[PDB]
Amino acid sequence: MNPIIYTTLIMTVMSGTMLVMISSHWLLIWIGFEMNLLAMIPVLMKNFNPRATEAATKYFLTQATASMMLMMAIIINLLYSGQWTITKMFNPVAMTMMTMALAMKLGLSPFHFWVPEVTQGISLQAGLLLLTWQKLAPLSVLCQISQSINPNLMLTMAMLSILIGGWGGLNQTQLRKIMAYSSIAHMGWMTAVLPYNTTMTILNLLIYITMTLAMFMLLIHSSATTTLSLSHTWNKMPVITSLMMVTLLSMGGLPPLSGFMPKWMIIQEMTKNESIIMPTLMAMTALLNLYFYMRLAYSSSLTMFPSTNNMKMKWQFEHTKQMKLLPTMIVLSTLVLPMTPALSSLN
Amino acid sequence: MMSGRPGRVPLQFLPNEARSLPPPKLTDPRLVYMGFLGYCSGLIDNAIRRRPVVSAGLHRQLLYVTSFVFFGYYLLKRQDYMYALRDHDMFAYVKSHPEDFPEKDKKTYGEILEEFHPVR
Amino acid sequence: MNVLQIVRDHWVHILVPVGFVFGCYLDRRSDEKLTAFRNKSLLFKRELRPNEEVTWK
Amino acid sequence: LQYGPLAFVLGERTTRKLTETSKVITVDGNICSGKGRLAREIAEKLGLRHFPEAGIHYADSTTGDGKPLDVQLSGNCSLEKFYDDPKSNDGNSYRLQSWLYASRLLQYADALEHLLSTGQGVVLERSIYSDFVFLEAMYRQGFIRKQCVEHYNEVKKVTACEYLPPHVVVYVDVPVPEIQSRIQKKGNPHEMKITAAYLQDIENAYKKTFLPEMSEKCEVLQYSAREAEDAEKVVEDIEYLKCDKGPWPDQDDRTFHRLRMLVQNKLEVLNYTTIPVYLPEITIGAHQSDRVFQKFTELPGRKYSPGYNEDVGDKWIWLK
Amino acid sequence: DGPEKNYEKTMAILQIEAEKAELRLKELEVRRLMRARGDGPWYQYPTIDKALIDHSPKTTPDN
Amino acid sequence: MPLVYMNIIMAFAIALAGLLMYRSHLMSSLLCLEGMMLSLFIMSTLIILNTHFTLANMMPIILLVFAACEAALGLSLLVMVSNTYGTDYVQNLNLLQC
Amino acid sequence: PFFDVQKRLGLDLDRWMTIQSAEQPHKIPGRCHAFEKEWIECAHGIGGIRAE
Amino acid sequence: IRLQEDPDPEDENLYEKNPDSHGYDKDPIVDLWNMRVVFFFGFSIVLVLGSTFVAYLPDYRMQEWARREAERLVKYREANGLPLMESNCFDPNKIQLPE
Amino acid sequence: RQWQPDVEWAEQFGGAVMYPTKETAH
Amino acid sequence: MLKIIIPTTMLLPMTWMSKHNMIWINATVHSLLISLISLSLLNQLGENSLNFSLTFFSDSLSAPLLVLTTWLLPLMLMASQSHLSKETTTRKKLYITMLILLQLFLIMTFTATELILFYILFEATLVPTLIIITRWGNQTERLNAGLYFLFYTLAGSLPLLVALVYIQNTTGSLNFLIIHYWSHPLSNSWSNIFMWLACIMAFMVKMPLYGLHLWLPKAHVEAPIAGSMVLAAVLLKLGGYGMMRITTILNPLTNYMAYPFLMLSMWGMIMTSSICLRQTDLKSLIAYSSVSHMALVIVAIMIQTPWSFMGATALMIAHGLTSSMLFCLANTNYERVHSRTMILARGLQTLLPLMATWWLMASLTNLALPPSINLIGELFIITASFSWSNITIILMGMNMMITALYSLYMLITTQRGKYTHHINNIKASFTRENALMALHILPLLLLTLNPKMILGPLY
Amino acid sequence: KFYIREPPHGSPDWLKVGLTLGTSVFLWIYLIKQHKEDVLEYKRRNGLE
Numbered sequence A: 001m002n003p004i005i006y007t008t009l010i011m012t013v014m015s016g017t018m019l020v021m022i023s024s025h026w027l028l029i030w031i032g033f034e035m036n037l038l039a040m041i042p043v044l045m046k047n048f049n050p051r052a053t054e055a056a057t058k059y060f061l062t063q064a065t066a067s068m069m070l071m072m073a074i075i076i077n078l079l080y081s082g083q084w085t086i087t088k089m090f091n092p093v094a095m096t097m098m099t100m101a102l103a104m105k106l107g108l109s110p111f112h113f114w115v116p117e118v119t120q121g122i123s124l125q126a127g128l129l130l131l132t133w134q135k136l137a138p139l140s141v142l143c144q145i146s147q148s149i150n151p152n153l154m155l156t157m158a159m160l161s162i163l164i165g166g167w168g169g170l171n172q173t174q175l176r177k178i179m180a181y182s183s184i185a186h187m188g189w190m191t192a193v194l195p196y197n198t199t200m201t202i203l204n205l206l207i208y209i210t211m212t213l214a215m216f217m218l219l220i221h222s223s224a225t226t227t228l229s230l231s232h233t234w235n236k237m238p239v240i241t242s243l244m245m246v247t248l249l250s251m252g253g254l255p256p257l258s259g260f261m262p263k264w265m266i267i268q269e270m271t272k273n274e275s276i277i278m279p280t281l282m283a284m285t286a287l288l289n290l291y292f293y294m295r296l297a298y299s300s301s302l303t304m305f306p307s308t309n310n311m312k313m314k315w316q317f318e319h320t321k322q323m324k325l326l327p328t329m330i331v332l333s334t335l336v337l338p339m340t341p342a343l344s345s346l347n
Numbered sequence B: 001m002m003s004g005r006p007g008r009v010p011l012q013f014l015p016n017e018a019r020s021l022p023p024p025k026l027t028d029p030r031l032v033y034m035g036f037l038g039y040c041s042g043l044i045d046n047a048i049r050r051r052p053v054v055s056a057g058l059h060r061q062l063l064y065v066t067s068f069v070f071f072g073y074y075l076l077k078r079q080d081y082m083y084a085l086r087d088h089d090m091f092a093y094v095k096s097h098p099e100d101f102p103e104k105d106k107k108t109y110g111e112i113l114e115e116f117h118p119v120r
Numbered sequence C: 001m002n003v004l005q006i007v008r009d010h011w012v013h014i015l016v017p018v019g020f021v022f023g024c025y026l027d028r029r030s031d032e033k034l035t036a037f038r039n040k041s042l043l044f045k046r047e048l049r050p051n052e053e054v055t056w057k
Numbered sequence D: 001l002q003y004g005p006l007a008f009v010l011g012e013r014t015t016r017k018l019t020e021t022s023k024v025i026t027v028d029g030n031i032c033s034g035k036g037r038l039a040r041e042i043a044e045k046l047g048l049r050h051f052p053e054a055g056i057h058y059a060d061s062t063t064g065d066g067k068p069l070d071v072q073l074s075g076n077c078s079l080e081k082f083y084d085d086p087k088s089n090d091g092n093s094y095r096l097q098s099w100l101y102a103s104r105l106l107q108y109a110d111a112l113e114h115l116l117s118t119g120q121g122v123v124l125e126r127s128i129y130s131d132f133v134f135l136e137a138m139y140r141q142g143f144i145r146k147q148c149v150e151h152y153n154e155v156k157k158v159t160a161c162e163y164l165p166p167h168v169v170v171y172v173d174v175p176v177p178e179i180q181s182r183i184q185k186k187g188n189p190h191e192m193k194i195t196a197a198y199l200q201d202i203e204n205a206y207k208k209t210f211l212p213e214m215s216e217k218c219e220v221l222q223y224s225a226r227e228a229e230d231a232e233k234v235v236e237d238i239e240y241l242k243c244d245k246g247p248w249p250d251q252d253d254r255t256f257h258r259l260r261m262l263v264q265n266k267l268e269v270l271n272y273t274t275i276p277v278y279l280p281e282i283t284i285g286a287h288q289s290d291r292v293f294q295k296f297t298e299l300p301g302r303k304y305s306p307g308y309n310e311d312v313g314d315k316w317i318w319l320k
Numbered sequence E: 001d002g003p004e005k006n007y008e009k010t011m012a013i014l015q016i017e018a019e020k021a022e023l024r025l026k027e028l029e030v031r032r033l034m035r036a037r038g039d040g041p042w043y044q045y046p047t048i049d050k051a052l053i054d055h056s057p058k059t060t061p062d063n
Numbered sequence F: 001m002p003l004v005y006m007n008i009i010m011a012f013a014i015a016l017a018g019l020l021m022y023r024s025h026l027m028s029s030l031l032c033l034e035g036m037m038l039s040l041f042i043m044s045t046l047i048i049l050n051t052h053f054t055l056a057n058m059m060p061i062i063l064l065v066f067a068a069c070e071a072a073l074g075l076s077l078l079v080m081v082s083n084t085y086g087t088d089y090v091q092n093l094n095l096l097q098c
Numbered sequence G: 001p002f003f004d005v006q007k008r009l010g011l012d013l014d015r016w017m018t019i020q021s022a023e024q025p026h027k028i029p030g031r032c033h034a035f036e037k038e039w040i041e042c043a044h045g046i047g048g049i050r051a052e
Numbered sequence H: 001i002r003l004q005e006d007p008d009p010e011d012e013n014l015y016e017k018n019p020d021s022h023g024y025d026k027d028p029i030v031d032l033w034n035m036r037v038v039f040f041f042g043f044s045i046v047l048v049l050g051s052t053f054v055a056y057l058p059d060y061r062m063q064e065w066a067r068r069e070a071e072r073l074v075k076y077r078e079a080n081g082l083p084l085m086e087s088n089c090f091d092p093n094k095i096q097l098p099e
Numbered sequence I: 001r002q003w004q005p006d007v008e009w010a011e012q013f014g015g016a017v018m019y020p021t022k023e024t025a026h
Numbered sequence J: 001m002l003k004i005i006i007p008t009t010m011l012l013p014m015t016w017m018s019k020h021n022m023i024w025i026n027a028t029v030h031s032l033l034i035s036l037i038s039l040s041l042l043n044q045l046g047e048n049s050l051n052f053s054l055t056f057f058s059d060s061l062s063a064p065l066l067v068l069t070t071w072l073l074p075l076m077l078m079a080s081q082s083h084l085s086k087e088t089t090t091r092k093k094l095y096i097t098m099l100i101l102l103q104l105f106l107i108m109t110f111t112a113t114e115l116i117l118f119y120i121l122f123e124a125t126l127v128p129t130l131i132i133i134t135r136w137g138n139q140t141e142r143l144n145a146g147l148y149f150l151f152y153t154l155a156g157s158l159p160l161l162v163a164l165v166y167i168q169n170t171t172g173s174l175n176f177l178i179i180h181y182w183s184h185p186l187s188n189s190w191s192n193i194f195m196w197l198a199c200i201m202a203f204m205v206k207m208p209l210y211g212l213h214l215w216l217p218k219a220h221v222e223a224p225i226a227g228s229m230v231l232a233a234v235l236l237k238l239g240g241y242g243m244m245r246i247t248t249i250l251n252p253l254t255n256y257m258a259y260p261f262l263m264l265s266m267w268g269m270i271m272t273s274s275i276c277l278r279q280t281d282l283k284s285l286i287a288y289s290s291v292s293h294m295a296l297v298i299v300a301i302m303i304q305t306p307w308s309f310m311g312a313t314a315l316m317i318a319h320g321l322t323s324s325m326l327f328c329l330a331n332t333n334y335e336r337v338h339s340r341t342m343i344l345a346r347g348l349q350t351l352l353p354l355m356a357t358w359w360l361m362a363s364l365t366n367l368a369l370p371p372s373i374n375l376i377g378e379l380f381i382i383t384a385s386f387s388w389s390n391i392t393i394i395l396m397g398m399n400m401m402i403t404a405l406y407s408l409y410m411l412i413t414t415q416r417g418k419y420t421h422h423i424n425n426i427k428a429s430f431t432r433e434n435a436l437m438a439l440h441i442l443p444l445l446l447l448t449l450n451p452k453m454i455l456g457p458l459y
Numbered sequence K: 001k002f003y004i005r006e007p008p009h010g011s012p013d014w015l016k017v018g019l020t021l022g023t024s025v026f027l028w029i030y031l032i033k034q035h036k037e038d039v040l041e042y043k044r045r046n047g048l049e
């Protein structure tokens, strides 16, 4: 891809997301979604392998189904209310239909099998983009319309995302798949906290965005895609694996690392809303995420693995890609807990 | 909680009124800790690039801590303003609704019948 | 004797002592923020000394 | 600024600098078949620069002072052990072949970067496409196991396809018995201990897969020993061939950008040279890898990033 | 230091933390009330602004 | 809540069911998607024409505008699956399962 | 809107089409202009939770 | 065995090179200096001086104050004949009994 | 010498999934 | 407490930049001055807890444990450079950093004022211990050890977090002083029963209670020596300390649900002790003995009697010292033999007379020979339990009996016999370990002389 | 010297270094000026002094 073309496509993805997060008209929000979908496929197809074609397809048809469903909801709302403004749904059917219409975009419900597939098929950089930037728009729409959600549906969605993500992550050695399942689990956390206080949803989303950025760019700088290849990084470059394990402990949410602050704050919120079984359930089932986080950490830094002799030349040559914002990203990824009350800035 | 409060103007850090609050002190432990994050970010940056993490690129580390402190100051001012707004909306709503905030006819422990549990 | 090497070797040592002094300074600069009840507890509520204008620093 | 996406956005192309004289050549042949001689002759006759045949320490030449690092630190294998004791459980032979493959890979990478950056043509002694002749010739001689051969093929497919074949390649045809006599007269005791069947197998593997599959990728120039003796005629042959075969013509500036991106990142080039396959002569143990990496770190100029090591004579590190 | 040190320090700490505690309780109750009724500065929800409405005489008289 | 709306909504429902079920090909699913789009256009047009929301008649046009764009992108995806696969069927599209 | 840039810049991008009572071309009234106008003028600034 | 591994290093005892080894590190001078610092700080100023500290704190739990007020009120109550302690720790008169 | 992972320990999860079944197959 | 926090934090740069040879010396000496500074913290007001600031306070329960940790920190430093000699300087510096971060987290835990902050640092002790156990471990199931330890701790930790935030919403604050002064009676509601279970089971997991105690025979047995002693000596005390803090707002319900767990410990302390008798490894035997002693501390906690609390605190301190010393002795013998079965090297009393002694009073203190603080801490709990219920005594009376058996059994089977002829690597006793057991033993008898300090807040 | 080729950062870039210090001093004196403006403005807001 011509670099200018790639820049324009990225700008169009960002412009679609911005149009979603700044427009009041429902049609304009859908137009932003459409621009995002339209510009996302070539980014995946950048490397042009059959894996990329497979993943880009599976991405497309799911998103297209979700967007058409979103139109069905918008049109029903207009029919029953006569308003395009993004305030609240005046027809229960329209909203209990858009809840999953906006869900396949996030990929949390049983509408989640597409996420690991697309993540594994496409390249790692576009995987970072898909798992970080492609979630602000539907989450923004959900935040705007959170006033009129059916809490039972949204909470069931969040529970299923958490449970299946944590369980599926236990049975993959490819980094892209277990990161997709981790993203599903974090989607479940944020979507669970969504109906009560959207500020905690924003805080968890920001923490997840920065921390997944740090994790993925560490993966890119390590040039690893399978567990064995990542384990081999210790001989060539040990500081990457050392930061890997700390960032994985943050993935699991072990305090005093940054990853606890959302998991903590979310639990503080819904227990204020008389919800006690749900926070305990999520707190216990995050251990499934933690298990494969520690499995990845064990065979990356905590136990040095059989290396390859040709790495004698690999140590001889340094890196060239700068990986901008990485050292800052690790810092906000591990130690921001003492500045927890700063979440009031979001509110 | 406050995204729907009347009078809010979107997309601007401090809404002018916040200057009536005491600005956070430059010594503030929250601010200096955010400066510490600036130092740490320099350490990883040198370590991430195979550099003498302590002595390499003094300017780069110096830029890191300075940048963190500046955004640290504005975040702290923004942080304190919201908490001040939370208290303002609280007490104003408390005064505006006396019936929903009853007062308690204060009495001492000598008249409270607090049951005692024999610890056996 | 190469006293510059002496200081370069022995400047590891000063960190904990200066940290101790700083810690003492700080938790001294942690009671002046809690003078809300100086000579106000009824048990120790005594008069204010003519030459000593506070009960505790 | 080094060439990146920003340079293409700015307008830094490479079809502009690349001309007809910008050629990448490899002069290939049997052992001591005069390939280095003829490569040098075509080099300074056509005006093109010359990178010598990549060996164990060519990569050692690329980085730092260029002195050949310790054999243990630089791939713990020696050509002398190959020549003296061919069949042993330590498997120095396949380690030799793999390290030579990766060294020639980086040699071709630098060569491609050269004529895609400054436009000056490049000449070489053998390359990746002639690298397999050795490994197959050895394997046919009861030398290495087929698992090593399959690891070699899997590394070749995933670390050679991203590169593109040369412009022209010259073959110096010297008969194998003449090669045996030449090694007799050479004098080095290690090359005495050679199987003539191995030399005939090198010749066979050359003109059975290398030259045939070459002919469909670029233009081949088979010269006999006497024919390649008169270098003027071979250089005037390579001048007038057609220079119109292979993927070189149908090579847009965007694929030029791709190949420059690939060559400029050496860690990318040899990223798949260390794929996890766990071969008996390839897995350096955890303890051995730890100690050897520490030894490489204590070696001067290999502890910090190139240009930051204070022990070697750098300066301004504290504002660098 | 003397016992009065700890006595007055504990007075200040206890007063400050008790104020924090019942302020938190008041926060919870106020949030519940304002979310339930909406007659307060926060928890307001967006509604269509009236200035968008056009009052000029249309083609149909009894619009 | 009148009658024609029932028929258009029901047509959209069957088109949603048809999209969410594949049999062999990729073109058929895309056709079912554009049928969903057709039902959406007819429904929205009916709604806005009935309500005399004159400023909103552009909305079905923009619907069709992005409709054609998605159809084009989907069939280019099918072009690539045919180029790397010879055919367009989806059951043989399984290389990403592991 | 999530990040209402329109009110910040005072620029109209989609608010003209949001409601049926807005300034339509050639002053064509909506079918239910009067009811929409009354409902909108009723619950303006009162709050989206008090409106119901 | 498919894994190039060095032989396990022998368990190297410290005494073979300097017999005076204190079991701290290889170099005798820094080994000995670590000896001096531990045998100084662990025992002299922490074990001994610390024991003088803990044996000689100021008033602990005000037990001496407890005794020196205790015999005072025993003197008072036993002299005046009042029971030396009251079955109630708080005056029943000021306590308003329910119902 | 503490146990450092060897080849057979590495292969315990290096491929497909680390929980192999008949569904994993090949 | 920043007169102890700030120097501990600033101890990190010293090791992290010290030379290749000075890290051990500098860390040891400056940790010794840190312990000296924390020795002051034994200064305790009669009844008022020393409230240094809003977020930091100490009383007669937190201060002895804090002094124990600070005095302990040089001991891992002295016990580690034997098995850490052949390592890169950066790796050694990080091992030291893990130890300092562990001690720092323990100090903030013991001096914390709000229950949520206590939970934060209490659990946050997991990470440095996890790194120590996993990376620097030498045995096989160290990787399994880390998983078992982390998951066992967290499975109780998270419900505790939910209970604490619920308490904050309901009561108003998690501050210890508020929840004690403004304490309210707890009704026998089943939701309150589950709240009590959430507030109790985390600490009882780290106690450990019988049954869910499998993380110690699979964690302490595997960790490097420094990790092993910091685990057994203090990290076990975390649950007891937390329970002592939390039973203020857990009454009068406790008694009704005290019945299952109490006897679960009371019976359990027998089985563990029996498991000690038929052991094969020294470290496993010490771990099971630690489980039994901590179960006795559990019983002391759930009696909720003043005497029970004082005996509990004394037992925590004495058990920490004794377990650390026993683990150090086991490491010395194991390193000398490079194996851990307690049959490979026996009859070493003659070869190493000072080790023979160190083992003798290590066993004696483990056996609770009076008037050592171990014996008085045990006996106070025994008397409190007898006051609560008489029959307890026989079970109690069984324990030390079986304890005494194994308390001498290993000493009989490791030094009190005939040496093994084929082994010869047992060299002269390096004075490092002998000195280390000295710094273990003399404070034990010193505190025996004046047990009013380790007696707890009830004294 | 050691490296046959010139190093990527061997001789430091006077340019980027110059901007680094130039922006850092900017951030510092803007921070100070802002703090003084806030403290004086807060003093005159509620009429404290």
Ligand SMILES: CCCCCCCCCCCCCCCCCC(=O)OC[C@H](COP(=O)(O)OCCN)OC(=O)CCCCCCCCCCCCCCCCC
Binding pocket: C009, C010, C011, C013, C014, C017, H029, H030, H033, H034, H037, J025, J029
């Ligand atoms: C108060 C300021 C403290 C810091 C500045 C002063 C430092 C010295 C403090 C007093 C020391 C008195 C005894 C000095 C003995 C010196 C022996 C010696 O020279 O050892 C040097 C050596 C390291 O090698 P090198 O330095 O190169 O010298 C040998 C070259 N062939 O071998 C070595 O082992 C190095 C020296 C041994 C280590 C000495 C202990 C260092 C720390 C001592 C103080 C600890 C307490 C600090 C706080 C006190 C107040 C509370």
Ligand SMILES: Nc1nc2c(ncn2[C@@H]2O[C@H](COP(=O)(O)OP(=O)(O)OP(=O)(O)O)[C@@H](O)[C@H]2O)c(=O)[nH]1
Binding pocket: D029, D030, D031, D032, D033, D034, D035, D036, D037, D053, D079, D096, D097, D100, D101, D125, D126, D130, D131, D132, D134, D135
């Ligand atoms: N195993 C192995 N050895 C190789 C390979 N390429 C080159 N070598 C060795 O590198 C040296 C190449 O020598 P040649 O160039 O054939 O002959 P020469 O004696 O240098 O003389 P000229 O051909 O005239 O330069 C010999 O030791 C080869 O065995 C390869 O792919 N594999």
